[PDB]
Chain A
Amino acid sequence: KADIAIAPLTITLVREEVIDFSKPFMSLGISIMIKKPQKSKPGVFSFLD
């Protein structure tokens, strides 16, 4: 149905069994998403801080 796919498709072993793949253009990995640490209320711990 298509000729070539230019899209972020994950290159796996089970997808090599039917089609081919070129070399990766951009490497990546699994990351950690947290919020930015803003100013939190320190409270009673501020006296001997």
Chain B
Amino acid sequence: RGVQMLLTTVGAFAAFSLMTIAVGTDYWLYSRGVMTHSGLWRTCCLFKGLCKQIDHFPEDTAEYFLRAVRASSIFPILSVILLFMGGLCIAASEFYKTRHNIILSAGIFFVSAGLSNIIGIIVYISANAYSYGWSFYFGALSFIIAEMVGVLAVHMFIDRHKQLRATAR
């Protein structure tokens, strides 16, 4: 009962922590004119040690729209804020669960936040056009943990719904 809820809570916490680490640094790696890492905000070379914001958006209208989406990381930041809101909703629904319908909306918002994070990962991969960083793999692992946590959350929701349907009859 509560063990699966605690597992879902620590999975959401670990996914939020890995998303924070993906926001932080070392998201990608690019050999400049020597390798250099980047975390979608600034770049740091491997002189060696100097760091600066290399996320310069200038140097069809769909190319300018894609550049505006890739600039400032509009998708994954709002995705992480939506994951924080879903985690706050799950924490508010864990204690004193009066209404048995907020968990479904919280899980739906959590799955939509995961889909938006996958869309932001697709944007960050499309804007790259050599190696990769470890925080990209950490964000992918957080996406996998978020998918499994959403599966476990909707499984607990349909179990609680079946329990309510059995007790209501």
Contacts and interface: CB of A to CB of B under 8 A. Distances in A.
Interface of A: 41, 43-45
Contacts of A41: 63, 129
Contacts of B63: 41, 43
Interface residues of B, number: 5
A44 B62 contact: yes
Given A43-B60, A45-B62, 8 more contacts: A41-B63, A41-B129, A43-B62, A43-B63, A43-B66, A44-B62, A44-B66, A45-B60
A45 B66 CA distance: 13
B154 to A, nearest CB: 32
Nearest to B126: A43
Contacts of A44: 62, 66
B104 to A, nearest CB: 34
B87 to A, nearest CB: 34
A43 B126 CA distance: 9
